[PDB]
Amino acid sequence: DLKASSLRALKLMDLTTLNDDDTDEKVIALCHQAKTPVGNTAAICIYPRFIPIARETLKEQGTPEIRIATVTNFPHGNDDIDIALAETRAAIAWGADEVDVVFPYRALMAGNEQVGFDLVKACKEACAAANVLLKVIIETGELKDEALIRKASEISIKAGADFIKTSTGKVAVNATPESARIMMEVIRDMGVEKTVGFKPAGGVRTAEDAQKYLAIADELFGADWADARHYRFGASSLLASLLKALGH
């Protein structure tokens, strides 16, 4: 069971490093790690300033189709649309293939549903012009309440999210199977399975963890739904666990 799930999960990874002190050397090492004996990850995920060196590293190792994702309005999810949009425009200028923006979740918790729509919509319009996919992080671990997790997912989808994502990986609680089910149920209920992907991020540590998340996906949408356009794992150490389950 774990071998089949681990090969699927590996090819859906957004292999991530997002540290306050990352270096070119660490990003280069991450790019090399993304090219495994059993397949390439879907993407890497790095801060915007590392996109040029990552792009050249991916080309020079012959994996030019590994996508480069980055983060904006991050990790805070503040409710200043001008800053979030400026950061998103800068990430596009740095060369991002995908932008993972943090939803203004504390503003939603305070009762403001509109700012989340306007922020996501503005960032989507910049990305769409550049053929850049937009993922939206709702920070389920800080929203906590099921109704707020559903509402943030709904707002993000209505505003044009291409993916909804659980977490930044920078708070106490990130992805859980519970949160993943709630968010994928919204994708189902809104009828957007064709156009909106799901990404659990943070706290996905083992091949066993990955298998549980994919089981939810297969149950809700069919075993043929998950692919790079519809599913990613936001993770790092997971990759070594997947390779171990596959005999590497």
Side-chain angles (χ1 to χ4, degrees), residues 19-24 26-93:
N19 302 297
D20 58 89
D21 60 356
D22 280 342
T23 61
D24 289 354
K26 291 177 177 182
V27 169
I28 288 167
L30 183 107
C31 290
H32 296 334
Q33 287 160 25
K35 177 187 185 180
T36 92
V38 304
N40 299 331
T41 64
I44 59 165
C45 185
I46 59 184
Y47 278 119
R49 60 193 186 271
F50 298 114
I51 296 172
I53 191 55
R55 183 78 72 193
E56 292 317 282
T57 306
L58 293 171
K59 289 178 198 174
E60 286 181 7
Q61 69 180 18
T63 63
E65 300 308 312
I66 297 184
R67 309 149 179 86
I68 305 176
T70 191
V71 294
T72 63
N73 206 35
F74 181 100
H76 39 78
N78 288 343
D79 65 355
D80 188 317
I81 293 177
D82 296 322
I83 291 184
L85 181 54
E87 288 186 0
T88 297
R89 289 165 166 172
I92 295 168

Side-chain angles (χ1 to χ4, degrees), residues 83-164:
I83 291 184
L85 181 54
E87 288 186 0
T88 297
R89 289 165 166 172
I92 295 168
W94 276 107
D97 300 316
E98 310 178 346
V99 170
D100 296 21
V101 64
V102 189
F103 185 96
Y105 62 88
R106 292 196 197 288
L108 175 67
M109 295 162 69
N112 184 343
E113 295 180 354
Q114 192 183 314
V115 66
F117 180 91
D118 294 340
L119 190 152
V120 170
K121 181 162 180 285
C123 293
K124 174 56 181 295
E125 294 191 349
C127 288
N131 195 29
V132 166
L133 283 188
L134 184 74
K135 317 199 193 82
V136 179
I137 299 162
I138 61 168
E139 205 71 291
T140 54
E142 291 296 314
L143 288 174
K144 292 170 193 179
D145 174 80
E146 169 176 6
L148 289 172
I149 290 172
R150 293 192 188 274
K151 183 56 66 175
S153 299
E154 177 193 69
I155 296 169
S156 300
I157 287 169
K158 283 166 61 178
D162 299 311
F163 269 79
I164 52 175

